[PDB]
């Protein structure tokens, strides 16, 4: 039953162990659970150059999406203070059982390089990005460097 989700990840990992993601590094997961992973999303495009995501795989996987959640304080209009993210790829409208993880991340990553107020999870700085940009980039490199 739930031994089949662990059965796929195993395959998915070795594929990463070889090639490797260049924008996602340091994936640590004990061979016991395997229903959850830890890691670091280290972006190269400012203002986030100068985050510990914790993707949690479900049991019925891969017939449900993974729940990527942030264990680090972030200043994004798409990331709730609880770490929650409203991602399209891991959303129950675009989910095909055939999606890898190197794709679910390449998506969650390219999101920070070009955010979207279309599906914002916080009205705290949604309009902030809208009207004054320099105010979201002179107020971002700060919050990024404080935590």
């Amino acid at each position: 039953g739930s031994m089949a989700a662990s059965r796929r990840l195993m395959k998915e990992l070795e594929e990463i162990r070889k090639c490797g993601m260049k924008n996602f590094r340091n994936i640590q997961v004990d061979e016991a659970n395997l229903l959850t992973w830890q890691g670091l999303i280290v972006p190269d495009n400012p203002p986030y150059d100068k985050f510990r995501i914790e993707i949690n795989f479900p049991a019925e996987y891969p017939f449900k999406p993974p729940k990527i959640t942030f264990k680090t304080k972030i200043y994004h209009p798409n990331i709730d203070e609880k770490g929650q993210v409203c991602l399209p790829v891991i959303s129950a409208e675009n989910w095909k059982p055939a999606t890898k993880t190197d794709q679910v991340i390449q998506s969650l990553i390219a999101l920070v390089n070009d955010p979207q107020p279309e599906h914002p999870l916080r009205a705290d700085l949604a309009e902030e990005y809208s009207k004054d940009r320099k105010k979201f980039c002179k107020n971002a490199e700060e919050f990024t460097k404080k935590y």
């Binding site: 031994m3 395959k11 409203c86 959303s91 409208e93 095909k96 059982p97 055939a98």
Partner: protein, 606 residues
């Protein structure tokens, strides 16, 4: 202690006495009871070891239960006797007529040379014949001959059209009910089955088995094989499609014709339904019909996969089936699938993975029972799960493909999917539905048909390409629930009907409360980014109702919510992404009280 001149009354006496005082080392004079007329008396239970009866006339006698080891009945008679449960070990019964019920009658090591079981019988347990000398004996069909001993064959070919020759002895066919079919039913006349008689002679008699087999055929009417009589045709496959029978041509060529029509009729009649377990003879024989007719692979697809799943596993024929499969997945309707990111070994090899230890690899590929370019991929374990109502599944445990293009299964009607494309999973699904009470509850709440049959037909799927967030859509919905809700709490009048109707009427505070959580959970998903609401805007009237259900549950029995940190955050979310919350509440239910959750929440959302 006998002489045939003492009446049938005088004789009993001497015997019953005998049974009592059992010397063991009696004298020839004492044990001598030969030629004596014993027609009609009971002798059940007696200890008659070593007794002499050579010549005796036991016709119409009931000697059941009684011991007879080392007896000597050379030349005795048994017309319509009863010998059930008896013991005959080592006895001598050469040249002696036995026409009686021999239920579980033990003949181990006995001498039956030239005996004839003309029209005997047993009802459920066959006689015992290990190390019994039947050389020249006339045995009747159904008798299990395992361990037994028949002579080297005197006449290779047999004359009388009533007897079949298996080794040293004869298989009489006088009282055969006048139809060679009765004798060929392993499944229901197992006690009359001559196929059983033959197929259980020690290996030493293989050549005889084939000789006999070949001789049985010339007895069979093909114009009497018209009528389906499935257990006979089936029976034929299992017996004669096994060594040594496989090698003999004159036989095999006779089966193909008789087997093709049958297994065809079979594959057809059991298509889109569970596949009946079958012996090696039968199973193999099916594989050959799929080898010969590359078409059925598609016309009876489900019927075909299961066969191959049993074949693949079946020792002695594993590679022959694995072969047949990899000639199927060359189909222009299948190949597209085979070259899929994660199918089979995953080596991208495009070949199935046969080395698994938990049957959880994705090899099996089904095709739609209709022309709509649809095909799913699954795992033996998963294929199984989704085969039973009771299982705690959701029938989404696979990879759906429209024209070789992967799909988001969720945007699919599970009913319309299992009912027209893959009718197998349909019986297990549309029963897991009947059981689910969500649709029955949603029948009480709402009463506007134009709307009612709009939420039911959407609870059979996940994502819905149908929205209702519009300024005119929320105008349809609000119209419905205004009379039910109370701002953001449960309008007292409702809680009257609710806890009163057939739903919760007469239900413990534990279970009554429990239920409420689920139904509350239901409407959250309704207004989810997944369903009616978008991830940006969400139908406030539903989130509203939800809040009340999760609440009025609390005041019924809080020992269901457990923590209250939860309860506060549940509201701290439903009021002020309806998506994150749904599973958040679904997963706690499958954890706190699964049994009530698999009963009161859309099977297709599990």
């Amino acid at each position: 202690q006998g002489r045939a001149c003492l009446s049938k009354a005088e004789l009993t006496a001497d015997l019953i006495w005998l049974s009592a005082n059992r010397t063991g080392e009696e004298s020839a004079e004492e044990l001598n009871y030969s030629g004596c007329d014993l027609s009609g008396l009971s002798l059940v239970g007696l200890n008659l070891s070593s007794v002499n009866f050579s010549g005796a006339v036991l016709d119409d006698t009931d000697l059941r239960m009684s011991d007879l080891s080392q007896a000597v009945l050379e030349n005795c008679s048994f017309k319509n006797s009863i010998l059930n449960e008896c013991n005959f070990c080592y006895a001598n019964l050469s040249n002696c007529i036995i026409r009686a019920l021999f239920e579980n009658s033990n003949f181990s090591n006995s001498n039956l040379k030239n005996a004839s079981f003309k029209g005997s019988s047993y009802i459920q347990y066959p006689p015992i014949l290990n190390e019994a000398d039947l050389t020249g004996a006339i045995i009747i069909p159904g008798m299990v001959l395992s361990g037994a001993i028949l002579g080297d064959v005197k006449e290779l070919f047999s004359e009388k059209s009533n007897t079949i020759n298996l080794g040293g002895c004869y298989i009489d066919l006088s009282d055969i009910q006048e139809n060679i079919l009765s004798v060929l039913d392993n499944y229901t006349k197992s006690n009359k089955s001559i196929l059983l008689t033959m197929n259980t002679s020690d290996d030493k008699y293989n050549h005889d088995k084939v000789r006999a087999a070949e001789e049985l055929i010339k007895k069979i009417s093909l114009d009497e094989l018209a009528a389906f009589r499935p257990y006979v045709k089936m029976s034929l496959a299992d017996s004669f499609s096994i060594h040594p029978y496989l090698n003999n041509a004159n036989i095999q060529q006779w089966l193909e014709p008789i087997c093709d029509d049958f297994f065809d009729t079979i594959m057809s009649w059991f298509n889109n339904s569970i596949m009946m377990y079958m012996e090696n003879g039968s199973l193999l024989q099916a594989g050959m019909y799929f080898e010969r007719h590359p078409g059925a692979m598609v016309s009876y697809n489900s019927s075909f996969i299961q066969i191959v799943m049993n074949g693949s596993r079946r020792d002695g024929m594993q590679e022959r089936f694995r072969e047949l499969y990899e000639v199927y997945l060359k189909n222009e309707k299948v190949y597209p699938v085979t070259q899929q990111s994660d199918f089979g070994l995953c080596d991208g090899s495009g070949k199935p993975d046969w080395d698994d230890d938990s049957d959880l690899a994705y090899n099996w590929v089904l095709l739609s029972s209709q022309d709509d370019g649809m095909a799913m991929m699954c795992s033996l374990s998963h294929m199984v799960d989704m085969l039973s109502p009771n299982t705690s599944t959701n029938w989404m445990s696979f990879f759906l493909y429209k024209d070789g293009e992967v799909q988001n299964t969720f945007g699919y009607s599970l009913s319309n999917l299992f009912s027209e494309s893959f009718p197998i999973f349909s019986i297990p699904y549309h029963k897991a539905f009947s059981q689910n009470f969500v649709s029955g509850i949603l029948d009480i709440l709402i009463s506007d048909n134009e709307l009612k049959e709009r939420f039911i037909e959407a609870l059979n799927s996940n994502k819905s390409d149908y929205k209702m967030i519009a300024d005119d859509q929320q105008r349809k919905l609000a119209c419905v629930w205004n009379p039910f809700l109370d701002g953001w709490e449960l309008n007292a009048q409702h809680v009257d009907m609710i806890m009163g109707s057939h739903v919760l009427k007469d239900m413990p505070l534990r279970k009554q409360a429990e239920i409420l959580f689920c139904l509350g959970g239901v409407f959250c998903k309704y207004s989810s980014s997944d369903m009616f609401g978008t991830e940006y805007d969400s139908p406030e009237i539903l989130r509203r109702y939800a809040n009340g259900l999760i609440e009025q549950a609390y005041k019924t029995d809080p020992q269901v919510f457990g923590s209250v940190y939860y309860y506060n955050d549940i509201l701290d979310r439903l009021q002020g992404c309806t998506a994150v919350l749904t599973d958040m509440l679904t997963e706690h239910a499958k954890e706190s009280f699964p049994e009530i959750f698999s009963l009161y929440y859309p099977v297709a959302w599990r």
